[PDB]
Design a protein around this ligand. Structure first.
Ligand SMILES: NC(=O)c1ccc[n+]([C@@H]2O[C@H](COP(=O)([O-])OP(=O)(O)OC[C@H]3O[C@@H](n4cnc5c(N)ncnc54)[C@H](O)[C@@H]3O)[C@@H](O)[C@H]2O)c1
Ligand SMILES: NC(=O)c1ccc[n+]([C@@H]2O[C@H](COP(=O)([O-])OP(=O)(O)OC[C@H]3O[C@@H](n4cnc5c(N)ncnc54)[C@H](O)[C@@H]3O)[C@@H](O)[C@H]2O)c1
Ligand SMILES: NC(=O)c1ccc[n+]([C@@H]2O[C@H](COP(=O)([O-])OP(=O)(O)OC[C@H]3O[C@@H](n4cnc5c(N)ncnc54)[C@H](O)[C@@H]3O)[C@@H](O)[C@H]2O)c1
Ligand SMILES: NC(=O)c1ccc[n+]([C@@H]2O[C@H](COP(=O)([O-])OP(=O)(O)OC[C@H]3O[C@@H](n4cnc5c(N)ncnc54)[C@H](O)[C@@H]3O)[C@@H](O)[C@H]2O)c1
Ligand SMILES: Nc1ncnc2c1ncn2C[C@@H](O)[C@@H](O)C(=O)O
Ligand SMILES: Nc1ncnc2c1ncn2C[C@@H](O)[C@@H](O)C(=O)O
Ligand SMILES: Nc1ncnc2c1ncn2C[C@@H](O)[C@@H](O)C(=O)O
Ligand SMILES: Nc1ncnc2c1ncn2C[C@@H](O)[C@@H](O)C(=O)O
Lengths: 430, 430, 430, 430
């Protein structure tokens, strides 16, 4: 392609490598895939074009993929999710990375297109996060379609769209749904957001959660992780939902479940963990308490109506990067975070490295699968063998010094399951 | 058959009806099935033979099936799980129930056989809990097999066996796996045991949980619900597991995961939420602290080796029904509860009525499905349409005064899902 | 006096002794006071007249005081708090105990009077709980006043009145405020109620706490322990308070703080942990949801207006002992528990033995102080030396296998405190 | 004195004012003291010399004291606790502030001395945090002693020393113990550290708390707040203590209490909330797991032996400001945070503004008390009238939209307390 890469500051690499150094020791999964595959190099010959937030954790993923003999050209899947010191260490490392914190819609797309063509040919693999890359290609670069051996979607929103495509026979290349791995969804979205949400908020506003009424729209794994977090600091969490089953779980957990039409008048902190549009409108903004902290954590920023804020506020003042304090015609203030984009990543460092090793291990596996055994994955979104899913968890058990139990021949017989073989039926919801 | 029924005391009906009365107002699911089907009577012509713990909640289930025009002959699936006042109110009601608290292995089977034959013919339906009924029939009364239109397994253990039969083409009649409904598993096993576990313990030993090291074997929904409970009262919960994924969840929740071989020496309270044999042996008993409270909550009592206690204790003293205090040769005491059988049901009243309405609503539905649309269920275990699973949750939302959100035409479009249509993919693990 | 004792059933002693036997091993404090004072008998010559709920734990207190050479004549401080098997074991043991579950206001007083006179003289000591005994004497038997060496109040309500008397120079004998010992208040009222509250509720109504909105009046240690309990089972706890400091704590803990005038319309479970009158009136009852569970845990039953229920209900039906289901003219039902009296003791077994060993150890010490060193306690309510309060905690650490840290000569120097000497200033609120 | 002030960058004021602007709206206590005293100016004629961390919250305190007509000259009581943008906004405002993040022991003292002399005379008041100021004066500038109307200690460690002085007749000026106000200790130390602890850790190491064994030395309010925090994120918290009562509370809360001599081999995160020396030594360092995160939160950095790390490490590498990664001779790594100094303030922004309003309100009051009614405070440390302590809490209730309850004439009579008068006896431990 063009320039070898492009980032905010390459002089940040020296620092980023330190972050990467510390990060590596916290991601047993990726480092594990390295020891057993560094030599084998199952990814040899592969040209992976990724679109995942360019953070330090992702840096370890990229360096792992390369260790497996892959050829990588990266880009961030969010205009604010990029970590400039992490990206600097990667570029300085020779990996063509085109990502920097605070890009423009235009620069963002350029960065993505920058990863399509390699030295010895175009991308033959895709590691997407949000579907932006797989979508760009399917609708703008069809010519390259027939050459991509596979897709790797990591987020719910993207995987959601992955199915949509198939639903219309649009999907033209076999995909593996990584986000929906037990070790992925139940650990990353849930446990990660629990720790990364409050971070985005605090680093941004530095507000005290205790004694505040926080409103969470959506009760999925992210909504569950977020709620738990605020609730654990002393905030009264109110939940809004459209799914009766997800609504009951919340109620059963002691959370009040209402409509944003009602909650907007009580909330002090508004978090949208939904992947839907029109979650927080002006009809709610005009109802929010003075200095209400509004932010979104759902992948795409389509939940909060920021345009309204910008088109109906009496005044807009920027506190600091990704922190704007509007003044409504009613005299009430509204603190909008990260311009409505992902809050943990846009205002903080995102999920911690240990939990990202889970998702990323699934990512390294998904890639080896699609590349190594293509004929095993027809055009359509697939899941990773539970035996593999089990391999991910088992990989981080040691760092935590967990001592797992081993079934005896008699017990395994009793339960009618392999001492090591998958211990749960597919339908099992862990 | 023989006698109209048989119970501990029919003079307990007057009281049991009061229990049923209060119970009904707490089970919106069953009462809901009642209003829309009381007249329709979709179960008309059905002769359901049940094997589910005979409790007050189950009483509402029986009185619901009958309201649906079904013909019912019940029995308890546990020699200690029976609620004598509940069973009295049922028999006095005219429903042939053969269950009483404290049956013998002999009297237990007799009770089951008592439900096979009806006035106008043998059983044409099965509502089992544990597989005991479906197993008795398959291996002892094959003749009646071909007449049964379907099975309804309610517990993991049972459903586990349901699949085992199919695995060997033994299952000879279409079954519906109710235990594995989102509203069933994630609410009953998890939220029920959370509240019913400590109950069994307290009513039995009346011990203080706070400051005690409790050991929980198995981290399934029951293990999860139990752990959370003890943990919430001030006990240090230690978990043992064979599944790395379930072990990671525990660790990620702040629980120490080890082997019973290790934990036995530290635990003060032992709870087996596993469905496997040889969980607590004498090798551990000989290692337990003085006055260690050991109990099991897994359906079948196959986890704790009580025989060893009875064959190796220096002395056995019975504190009160279902509470025995053993004296080991090492001088240490061991308080065994409910003789190893289910603790919440054997020493307490079981799960509360509100949560049982979820499981039981699934049961009423499973029955209407198999009976009504039989040709839709070939020999093999099946799940209940997610639309239905949603119907269960949605039915208890109101009691909790939950205000669910309604997708707009635009949002539904965005999300690409019906405003009411199932909101989650099948693979969704809620 | 008259009859040696009087109880519900002496043939319940054989059982009670088993309860006592198990209870003893769980109360390291009392058993500890036993080993070092069994021979010394510092209470020798004392004639203690107690008025504390006659439970198994209290049984260990009585048998301990006696082991200390004391002469005891007991009675319960509540018409429902008595444990008949416990009381039987005591009577059968020779200790004049006049208490049985379900006394009448008349029989209750008779029982108290029955403890004033001993073989070798009238009572020379008082071990009260609620102030009922110390009040009766001060206002009805002044003649015996001058003979009593001291008082031992165990509950907040009582101690509250103890000061009230002094405030009016009414208190005529030195009292020791046991309820306000760090090991007493922060562990008994808080940790005991946390476990004993739900018990009284469950054993009585057997209702599911999860998903229910529970309302708690008062945020003292009892309110704190109760709230935490319900909240931990999945109930949405709402708190009402008059103290801004106790209200802030709640808010800071994520609890909604409102007025009963508002909460009554939302609560599903009403618990009064206040010690004040007119907490739950008919103005609220007329506003409660159908089948609302109302109960009180505050010592005296002066918070809930039951007369109103009995005078305004359309009908009153008794479910079982201490459980009445009223029917309001509006069609809604109200489940009143234990007739408004203490719920954990009236409907359950009360606090567990382990936590009761704390309060009771303080009680044994209070008695030894007043008796042994009288001249050290002038007329007026006093506290127990912190060194002693520390002795109590220290006594139960072992059972929990806690390994405390020992200050070094250098550290003790640094901190400027005795390696063992009281580690906290008097004003310290632990 | 010398220069008008001295800070890191005055070009940081513009931003700091925004921080102050948002902060003010979150501190109802201070802003409340402003409205009712802005005109009155009770502090008129006062020359307050402060030694408290120079943060945004403290900035609102300074601007409040001034609004009260006081004359202030500030300085930070920690070489790393200073917030440069906050200090900038203050200096730019005209208030002589001599503080900047990252001072030297020499520069630190210089800054303190800079606050002793004012335009119209030397300091006549003292607002200390840690006792550093009141100690410098007492031992180095005795001459100015006789002119100081009072002292205001804000932290436990400080107040601890305040008493020590008095214990030896060293304290030569009346002090008010602010740290020990109900609204101070139980809210700041507990609720603040809960939120500010994890911040310092995360912003420094960005580590995932979930699944990690965190070790907390000391179970005071700070230990309590810290433990709860980690515990709530999924980390297994182990506690070490010297006080049996504080140890029992922990045990009663489900925490394992042991010796650091034992925990050092299991902990993944070490937090010292103690105020004592020799808490974490090399004997423990040599026993810590690889990449063990060690940090202190106790006022003075005397708990962790960093010297040992610097004198026995094989290599020391600085990750970033206040983050150093040592390499032990055993191959294990140790991540030392903030060079052992306060972690929440040295690596994060400290306690949130809302909780700081409580402590600071008490500070504004302590100042008005000592200054206004001096003769009411003889030489010695005093507490703030509970009625006042109540005023603080009541001031923040509104922001939280808390609806307090009002005692009626009948209830206040029954309870025997003023409808508004202090609702708790002095000994009350809230
Ligand atoms: N920023 C991050 O670190 C991060 C990490 C993981 C996932 N995500 C993103 O967050 C989003 C949610 O992911 P998830 O795994 O929790 O999804 P999920 O499907 O489990 O849950 C989303 C929930 O939203 C609810 N919902 C939908 N429309 C709603 C509406 N109008 N009002 C209220 N609730 C509504 C749904 O019923 C569902 O339970 C996705 O876009 C995902 O890609 C972000
Ligand atoms: N008494 C009740 O109220 C009640 C309610 C629901 C279910 N149950 C019963 O409880 C049992 C558990 O049900 P569930 O839904 O939680 O099952 P589950 O399959 O979700 O979990 C059981 C767990 O045990 C673990 N396990 C298996 N063998 C083990 C061993 N040797 N050591 C440690 N862990 C081991 C498994 O890995 C698994 O995670 C079943 O028998 C079920 O029928 C009882
Ligand atoms: N049944 C038991 O096991 C048990 C155990 C301990 C104590 N108690 C009793 O419970 C009562 C509470 O004891 P405590 O130690 O927690 O007392 P406490 O003084 O600490 O707390 C009582 C709380 O009630 C609040 N309050 C007072 N009037 C109120 C009103 N009208 N509305 C709302 N809140 C109001 C007060 O502000 C206070 O915080 C006492 O009577 C005590 O003797 C019972
Ligand atoms: N950085 C901050 O934001 C912040 C906020 C409040 C307080 N503090 C400081 O933190 C320190 C703790 O304050 P606190 O109010 O919790 O004090 P505290 O007296 O309530 O508790 C300190 C605890 O340490 C325990 N302890 C003492 N020596 C010990 C040892 N060798 N091993 C184990 N435990 C030991 C004591 O028994 C006590 O329970 C003080 O120096 C205080 O000034 C810092
Ligand atoms: N450090 C991170 N690196 C990459 N992605 C991050 C990170 N933090 C949060 N997400 C969001 C993802 O967890 C989410 O998009 C997903 O994987 O579903
Ligand atoms: N009241 C009850 N009635 C019937 N079954 C009860 C009850 N309580 C617990 N179980 C056990 C079931 O939850 C379990 O067997 C299952 O359904 O899986
Ligand atoms: N087993 C019990 N024995 C005696 N009193 C009990 C018991 N359970 C609760 N209380 C109430 C006391 O905790 C309360 O009155 C107090 O001591 O404050
Ligand atoms: N923003 C802050 N301003 C001032 N002090 C802060 C702050 N955060 C933590 N402390 C520490 C104090 O809470 C502690 O020293 C105390 O007051 O006890």
């Amino acid at each position: 392609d063009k320039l070898p890469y492009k980032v905010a500051d390459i002089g940040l690499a020296a620092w980023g490598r330190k972050a990467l150094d510390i990060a590596e020791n916290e991601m047993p999964g990726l480092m594990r895939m390295r020891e057993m595959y560094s030599a084998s190099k199952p990814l040899k010959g592969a040209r992976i074009a990724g679109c995942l937030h360019m953070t330090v954790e992702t840096a370890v993923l990229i360096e792992t993929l390369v260790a497996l003999g892959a050829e990588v050209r990266w880009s961030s899947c969010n205009i604010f999710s990029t970590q400039d010191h992490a990206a600097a260490a990667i570029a300085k490392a020779g990996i063509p990375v085109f990502a920097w914190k605070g890009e423009t819609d235009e620069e963002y797309l350029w960065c993505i297109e920058q990863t399509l063509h390699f030295k010895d040919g175009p991308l033959n693999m895709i590691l997407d996060d949000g579907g932006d890359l797989t979508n760009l290609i399917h609708t703008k670069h069809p010519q390259l379609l027939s050459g991509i051996r596979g897709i790797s979607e990591e987020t719910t929103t993207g995987v959601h769209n992955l199915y949509k495509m198939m639903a219309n026979g649009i999907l033209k290349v076999p995909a593996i749904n990584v986000n929906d791995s037990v070790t992925k969804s139940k650990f990353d979205n849930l446990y990660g957001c629990r720790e990364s949400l409050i971070d985005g908020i605090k680093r941004a506003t530095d507000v005290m959660i205790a004694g505040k009424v926080a409103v969470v729209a959506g009760y999925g794994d992210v909504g569950k992780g977020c709620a738990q977090a605020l609730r654990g600091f002393g905030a009264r969490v109110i939940i809004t939902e459209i799914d009766p089953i997800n609504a009951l779980q919340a109620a059963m957990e002691g959370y009040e479940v209402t409509t944003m039409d009602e909650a907007c008048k009580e909330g002090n902190i508004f978090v949208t963990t939904t992947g839907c549009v029109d979650i927080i409108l002006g009809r709610h903004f005009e109802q929010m308490k003075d200095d209400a902290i509004v932010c979104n954590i759902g992948h795409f920023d389509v939940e909060i109506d920021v345009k309204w804020l910008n088109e109906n506020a009496v005044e807009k003042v920027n506190i600091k990067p990704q922190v704007d304090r509007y003044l409504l015609k009613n005299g009430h203030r509204i603190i909008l975070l990260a311009e409505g984009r992902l809050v943990n990543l846009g205002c903080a460092m995102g999920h911690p490295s240990f939990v990202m090793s889970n998702s990323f291990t699934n990512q390294v596996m998904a890639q080896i699968e699609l590349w190594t055994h293509p004929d095993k994955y027809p055009v359509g979104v697939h899941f990773l063998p539970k035996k593999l899913d089990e391999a991910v968890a088992e990989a981080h058990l040691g760092k935590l010094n967990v001592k797992l139990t081993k079934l005896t021949e008699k017990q395994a017989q009793y339960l009618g399951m392999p001492i090591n073989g998958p211990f749960k039926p597919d339908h099992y919801r862990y």
